[PDB]
């Protein structure tokens, strides 16, 4: 699914991203339906922007703003998220 997030300057998107650090051997990772990406949503604030856009805990991040991040390390994915400022589009797959 694709979530479209557009927030106010002073607020957050309302989620916590967790996933593999670039310093680990991320080059050895092979995506599978049971673990489809390196980064995923640890939590989503209820009635936050991400929640209202349909994101939920356990969603694995496939794309950020059209860029595939399945095999991308944490800091680089965070950089792509922050690059859009108040606007963010994320393609995810739900583990649930």
């Amino acid at each position: 699914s694709v979530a479209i997030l557009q927030k106010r300057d002073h607020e957050g998107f309302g989620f916590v991203l967790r996933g593999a650090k670039a310093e680990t051997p991320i080059e050895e990772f092979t995506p599978t339906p049971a673990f489809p990406a390196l980064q995923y949503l640890e939590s989503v604030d209820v009635e936050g922007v991400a929640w209202k856009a349909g994101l939920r805990t356990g969603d694995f991040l496939i794309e950020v703003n059209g860029v595939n991040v399945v095999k991308v390390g944490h800091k680089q994915v965070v950089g792509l998220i922050r690059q859009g400022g108040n606007r963010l589009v994320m393609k995810v797959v739900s583990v649930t």
């Binding site: 957050g12 991203l17 967790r18 640890e42």
Partner: peptide, 6 residues
């Protein structure tokens, strides 16, 4: 792993 709030 790292964790970042956004």
């Amino acid at each position: 792993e790292a964790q970042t709030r956004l």
